[PDB]
Each structure stands twice: as structure tokens, then as C-alpha cells.
Structure 1
Amino acid sequence: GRKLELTKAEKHVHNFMMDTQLTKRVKNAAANVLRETWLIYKNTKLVKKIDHAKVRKHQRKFLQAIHQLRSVKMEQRKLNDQANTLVDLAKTQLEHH
């Protein structure tokens, strides 16, 4: 039988999307990663004159967007393991007779 094996986890977590909330969270946060990556790059590399108040501002917005994406990814992993728990429970009935 299955003995000590358990449902194999999805390697990367691109799922449970169209949970509109998580999906909307991703698009907005990802757009903001692009926004702040660009603005930090510009303000540290494409100016004659580095405005540090500007860099700090965009660093705050950059870290918040990056960490929002991490939050979604972690929640996806958690949802996936919750689902795998249910599949594992159902698979116990495969142990017969």
C-alpha cells in the first residue's frame, strides 16, 4: 500500500489564483515592484544629483511591494498544503481491505 507516502506537493505555487483577492493582490503589488524598482534605479543611477529623501521613499514602497508578493506566495503554499491534507485524508480509504 501507500505506507508512509503522502501527496506530492506542487513544486512552485502559481495556483489558487482567481481567488480574485489574491490575484488582485498580485497584480497590484507586482506593478508596484516594477514601479519602485524603476524609481529607485532612476534616482540612484540616472540622476546627476541623488535625492536621498526620494530614495528612502521609494525604498519603503519597494519593500512593501516585495513583501506583499512574498505574503501571497506564502499563502498559496499554505492553501496548497491544506488541500493536500484533504487529499491525503481521502487517500487513506485506498488502503484495503
Structure 2
Amino acid sequence: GRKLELTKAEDTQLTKRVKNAAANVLRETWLIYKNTKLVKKIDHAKVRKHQRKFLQAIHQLRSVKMEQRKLNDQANTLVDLAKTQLE
């Protein structure tokens, strides 16, 4: 039987969260780059502002990824339960 083995691992709301956050990672990556490497005179207030927006976007994408992993393991729990009947 399956003994101690378990299912091997690996929405629209989350999908919207991903596209908006990802676009903002692109936005703020670009604007930090521009303001730190393509200017004659770095404006730190500008860099700080875009660093705040960059970290928020990156952490939004991490949040989505973590939620996906959680959802995947919740579904795998249900598949594992169903598989007990294979015994």
C-alpha cells in the first residue's frame, strides 16, 4: 500500500493581485534604476519613495505566492484524505 507516502506537491482575485503587483515591481525597479544610475544628481527623496513602492510590490507578490502554496497544500490534504480509501 501507500504506507507513509503522501501526494507529491509542485483564482481571479489572486490573478488581479499578481498582475498589478508585478507591473508595480517593473515600475519601481525602473524608477529606482533611473534615479540611481541614469541621473547626474541623485534625488534621495525620489529614491526613498520608489524604494517604498518597490518593497510593497515585491512583498505583495511574495504574499500571493505564499497563499498559492497554502491553497495547494489544502487541496493536497483533501487528495491525501481521499487516497486513504485506496488502502
TM-score class, shorter-chain normalisation, is over 0.9
The equivalent position to 2:82 in structure 1, one of 71, 79, 90, is: 90
For 2:31 and 2:16, locate their aligned partners in 1 and report how far apart those are by CA, in whole Å: 22
Q: What is the CA deviation profile of residues 25-75 of structure 1, one whole-angstrom value per residue up to 9, with x for unaligned ones?
A: 000000000000000000000000000000000000000000000000000
Find runs of 4+ consecutive structure 1 residues off by over 2 angstroms: none
Matches within 5 A, 1:17-28: 19-28=11-20
**What CA RMSD, in Å, does the superposition of the two structures yield over aligned residues?**
0.2
SS of residue paired to 1:94:
coil
Segments of structure 2 that go 5 or more residues without pairing to the other structure are none
**TM-score using structure 1 length:** 0.89
- 2:45 is matched with 53
SS of residue paired to 1:22:
helix
Segments of structure 1 that go 5 or more residues without pairing to the other structure are 11-18
For 1:52 and 1:20, locate their aligned partners in 2 and report how far apart those are by CA, in whole Å: 37
**TM-score using structure 2 length:** 1.00
Size of the aligned set, in residue pairs, is 87
Q: What is the percentage of aligned positions where both structures have the same residue?
A: 100
Of Structure 1 and Structure 2, the greater helix share is in: 2
